[PDB]
Design a protein around this ligand. Structure first.
Ligand SMILES: O=S1(=O)CC[C@@H]1CNc1ncnc2[nH]c3cc(F)ccc3c12
Length: 167
């Protein structure tokens, strides 16, 4: 039993809710919140900008030190950093950004990072400003993640479309 509330169950292990991931993280305090990161951990907009703003820029400060030490992530890769006031940990995962021409097949590799964590609060990878089709992202999620994932979809119209079209 966990504290996630109001989710629709899609499969054995995948759940979905129309929610603001920032507000959801603030209420649940999950062990892991996933950020929709880029390789430079520059949290300027989308989910990343929202999560970073909610940490009063502490996420960005920590991220800049991470990059200065380790260099950029790979597209499809991830790193674990602090969850600050939102979660115990933040799993920064880099989905391909279609608006940069990155290969969509890397979306499966990106979701594989979730399997290293038993339970996660997450957005749909490569959705929003990353330019992928969220219906496709949900399908890859369901077919790749085996651990327990609670998906927050900010846009109510999109949430209803994802549910109604789910196979
Ligand atoms: O859901 S969508 O709009 C349709 C694709 C987008 C995915 N992005 C998100 N997914 C979940 N929670 C979220 N909270 C946010 C706060 C912001 F300021 C900007 C984006 C988000 C967001």
């Amino acid at each position: 039993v966990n504290s996630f509330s109001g989710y629709l169950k899609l499969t054995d292990n995948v759940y979905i809710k129309n929610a603001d991931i920032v507000e959801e993280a603030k209420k649940v305090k999950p062990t892991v919140v996933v950020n929709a990161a880029n390789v430079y951990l520059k949290h300027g907009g989308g989910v990343a900008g929202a999560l970073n703003k909610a940490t009063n820029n502490a996420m960005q400060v920590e991220s800049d030190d991470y990059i200065a030490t380790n260099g950029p992530l790979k597209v499809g890769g991830s790193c674990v950093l602090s969850g600050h006031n939102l979660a115990k940990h933040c799993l920064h995962v880099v989905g391909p950004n279609v608006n940069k021409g990155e290969d969509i097949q890397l979306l499966k590799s990106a979701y594989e990072n979730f399997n290293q964590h038993e339970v996660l609060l997450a957005p749909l990878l490569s959705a929003g400003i990353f330019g992928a089709d969220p219906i496709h992202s949900l399908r890859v999620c369901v077919d790749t993640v085996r651990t327990n994932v609670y998906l927050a979809v900010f846009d109510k119209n999109l949430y209803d479309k994802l549910v109604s079209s789910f196979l």
